[PDB]
Amino acid sequence: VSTLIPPKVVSSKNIGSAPNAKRIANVVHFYKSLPQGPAPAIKANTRLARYKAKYFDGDNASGKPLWHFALGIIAFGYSMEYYFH
Amino acid sequence: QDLYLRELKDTKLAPSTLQDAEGNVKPWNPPQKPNLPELELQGPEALKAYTEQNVETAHVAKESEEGESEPIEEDWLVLDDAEETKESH
């Protein structure tokens, strides 16, 4: 008999139902987000970090470190091969 | 003119008692004094609704109703109903 008032009732529930769950999921991660490679930490030195940076990095990612390890184990084992036989 | 004067006073005297003089009515027996002034005076009221329209009965306008001073229940119910339909826009 009178005029009910829909057009300003969105205060109680934000428009949409499915994207409401994703709103909180995607709005919160943008605060603590790296602008462009912040704190890359590409430089380190712990007597083995240089080897990791030079060979164990994703830029090369080749089979050369495995061959170097094989050569090193051969060099180490030559001495005890002489010692045993 | 004999063809004129006698017919003239004949056409004057015959309705003289009818209209000019108060001699009821001579040409026809039924009375006219208590018929058109009196019986037919209610004729328009007889054909129409007597004592119902000629009096022009005036009905005072009924007071226009409203929400009947409901400042809590009506507003809350309207808001809840709009909330029910807002999820399915």
Side-chain angles (χ1 to χ4, degrees), chain A residues 1-22 24-35 37-41 44 47-85, chain B:
Chain A
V1 67
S2 177
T3 168
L4 46 85
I5 177 153
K8 46 181 89 164
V9 306
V10 305
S11 41
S12 174
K13 299 286 202 224
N14 176 276
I15 63 168
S17 293
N20 280 347
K22 191 45 67 198
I24 188 74
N26 67 8
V27 76
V28 300
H29 64 227
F30 282 134
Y31 300 101
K32 278 80 68 180
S33 58
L34 270 55
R47 156 205 78 151
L48 268 80
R50 41 94 188 168
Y51 192 87
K52 301 190 288 181
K54 294 295 188 293
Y55 288 167
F56 289 167
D57 56 314
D59 199 2
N60 290 314
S62 295
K64 292 190 288 295
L66 184 62
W67 307 332
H68 281 286
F69 184 68
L71 185 60
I73 199 157
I74 290 157
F76 172 51
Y78 211 65
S79 79
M80 91 195 87
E81 172 62 33
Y82 275 160
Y83 299 152
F84 282 169
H85 189 195
Chain B
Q1 170 169 80
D2 274 335
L3 164 156
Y4 204 90
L5 38 63
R6 71 163 304 288
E7 74 91 19
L8 194 32
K9 74 201 71 53
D10 199 1
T11 51
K12 294 306 110 177
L13 64 92
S16 279
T17 67
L18 178 145
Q19 171 162 272
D20 299 277
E22 307 313 290
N24 194 51
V25 80
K26 64 181 183 293
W28 40 290
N29 283 114
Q32 103 172 63
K33 299 294 289 184
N35 224 337
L36 319 94
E38 150 53 14
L39 192 146
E40 207 171 1
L41 185 62
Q42 286 87 328
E45 301 171 352
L47 269 75
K48 199 171 54 66
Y50 180 48
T51 202
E52 287 287 292
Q53 176 49 78
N54 52 358
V55 302
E56 298 94 18
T57 168
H59 324 86
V60 186
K62 190 255 175 175
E63 172 275 345
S64 296
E65 72 176 3
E66 279 158 345
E68 301 311 300
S69 308
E70 198 68 33
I72 294 100
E73 190 271 332
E74 271 277 83
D75 302 67
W76 183 66
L77 186 55
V78 162
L79 180 52
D80 188 69
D81 289 331
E83 193 275 335
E84 278 159 42
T85 63
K86 89 197 208 173
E87 288 266 350
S88 43
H89 280 317

